[PDB]
Design a protein around this ligand. Structure first.
Ligand SMILES: [Mg+2]
Ligand SMILES: [Mg+2]
Ligand SMILES: [Mg+2]
Ligand SMILES: [Mg+2]
Ligand SMILES: [Mg+2]
Ligand SMILES: [Mg+2]
Ligand SMILES: [Mg+2]
Ligand SMILES: [Mg+2]
Lengths: 183, 123
RNA sequence: AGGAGGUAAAAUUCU
RNA sequence: CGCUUACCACUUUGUGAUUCAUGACUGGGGUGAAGUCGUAACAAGGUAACCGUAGGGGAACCUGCGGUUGGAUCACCUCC
RNA sequence: CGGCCGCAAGGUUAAAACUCAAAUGAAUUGACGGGGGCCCGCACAAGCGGUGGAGCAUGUGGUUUAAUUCGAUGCAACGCG
């Protein structure tokens, strides 16, 4: 029934945005941001375990992170992960703490990145929209099997529009947030 | 075969292609680090090798080995690089000259220092 | 002895 | 001297040729990984293979036609 | 790619980067064949009695467990050390 489908859409769509927002935080920024340094995987006694769980991540400044590895033995294995996450990152060890300089920001890059970002945004709007599409599909179909007044039908498809525009504007807030960084 | 033949078409020597456009066979050219990968070798070998893309003085965008154990190089580092492929990593036809411009000599080395850019330790 | 005729249905893979 | 004619450098307009670069995107390709589908080739590789050509088919490939050997097989029955 | 030829299908001419430390030929010893020949063994046939079903003894995978000690795993491990 309509009222059921609006739920399922709000949701699917929020999923869409949130998943955007995430891919975003995994991108070499202008600044620091432990968000990316998290995802990284470390070899932790055979069982892989995200670096997040073996060591603390500080912002030692704008353009340099400081990874306090709780367990000192793994220190060498942790570092290797930063270079093995292939993220253009060079982890300089120096006394119980792994310094990960954040690069300066070149021209080649800013481009490089924004184009990547803008296109991840558009892949995103595309997901949102696909949900527009099943949504209307469901309803559209509850028209025959006259289970809905032609009125009902217009109306709802409109909520779906409302939902879609909303999910999107979110997506574009996000994109803009980041675009600020890169520029 | 026939002299005759040869007079029409003299014998022509294959023209060698160099195995390294360090442009005008320069004994080594200057670069800046586009990025600093580390990849894995080929079929028989296994290790995380340390390398880096370089945007040369002559604007070629080839890639380069960073030899040795541990290097303090990154985005933007200006290096110098010499001819020397690394038959294991594909598309790595050059080495980074340790101890050159921004490149570092290798910490703690003792044997074979001149390669790897390390100063005779104050004995 | 030479000649003839006749006589297997299909059934993949393994760093 | 000035003037004026010839030749004539630069510069301009039109339309082509050529060549260097570079371009969203993209067929095909090599490499790597040793993943997915079957099992095409190597033994007669289980319908011998392959060359040319033509059609078809997710894929190796299948089928037609001619060619080539760069082809394995000659034992038992029945009769003669 | 260019040229030239063809109505077309296409042909002819004919590269380069990139990539590999091979590719290839013939002969050799084996192994192997849904190759051939000759020939063996309770291999088949021909027979007699069984297992596979049942209850139980016993071993093993498994499962469980505080522990179910370790080992043995196609034939040639499983009433095996
Ligand atoms: Mg087989
Ligand atoms: Mg298979
Ligand atoms: Mg392609
Ligand atoms: Mg076959
Ligand atoms: Mg066949
Ligand atoms: Mg034929
Ligand atoms: Mg018998
Ligand atoms: Mg029984």
């Amino acid at each position: 029934g309509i009222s059921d489908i609006r739920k399922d859409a709000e949701v699917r769509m929020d999923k869409c945005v949130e998943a955007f927002k995430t891919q975003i935080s995994k991108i070499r920024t202008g600044r620091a941001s432990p968000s990316l340094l998290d995802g990284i995987v470390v070899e932790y006694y055979g069982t892989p375990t995200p670096l997040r769980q073996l060591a603390s991540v500080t912002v030692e400044d704008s353009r340099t992170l400081k990874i306090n590895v709780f367990d000192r033995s793994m220190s060498p294995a942790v570092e290797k992960a930063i270079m093995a996450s292939d993220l253009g990152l060079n982890p300089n060890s120096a006394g119980s703490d792994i310094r990960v300089p954040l690069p300066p920001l070149t021209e080649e890059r800013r481009k490089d990145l924004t184009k990547i970002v803008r296109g991840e945004a558009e892949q995103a709007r595309v997901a949102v929209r696909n949900v527009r599409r099943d949504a209307n599909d469901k309803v559209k179909a509850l028209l025959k099997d006259k289970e809905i007044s032609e009125d009902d039908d217009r109306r709802s498809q409109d909520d779906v529009q409302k939902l879609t525009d909303a999910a999107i504007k979110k997506i574009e807030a996000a994109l803009a947030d980041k675009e600020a960084e890169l520029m | 075969a026939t002299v005759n033949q040869l007079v029409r078409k003299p014998r022509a020597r294959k023209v060698a292609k160099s195995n390294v456009p360090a442009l005008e066979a320069c004994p080594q050219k200057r670069g800046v680090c586009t990025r600093v990968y580390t990849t894995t070798p080929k079929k028989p070998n296994s290790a995380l090798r340390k390398v880096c893309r370089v945007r040369l003085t002559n604007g070629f965008e080839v890639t380069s080995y960073i030899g040795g154990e541990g290097h303090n190089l990154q985005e933007h580092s200006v290096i110098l690089i010499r001819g020397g492929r690394v038959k294991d990593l594909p598309g790595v036809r050059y080495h980074t000259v340790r101890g050159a411009l921004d490149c570092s000599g290798v910490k703690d080395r003792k044997q074979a220092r001149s390669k790897y850019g390390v100063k005779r330790p104050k004995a």
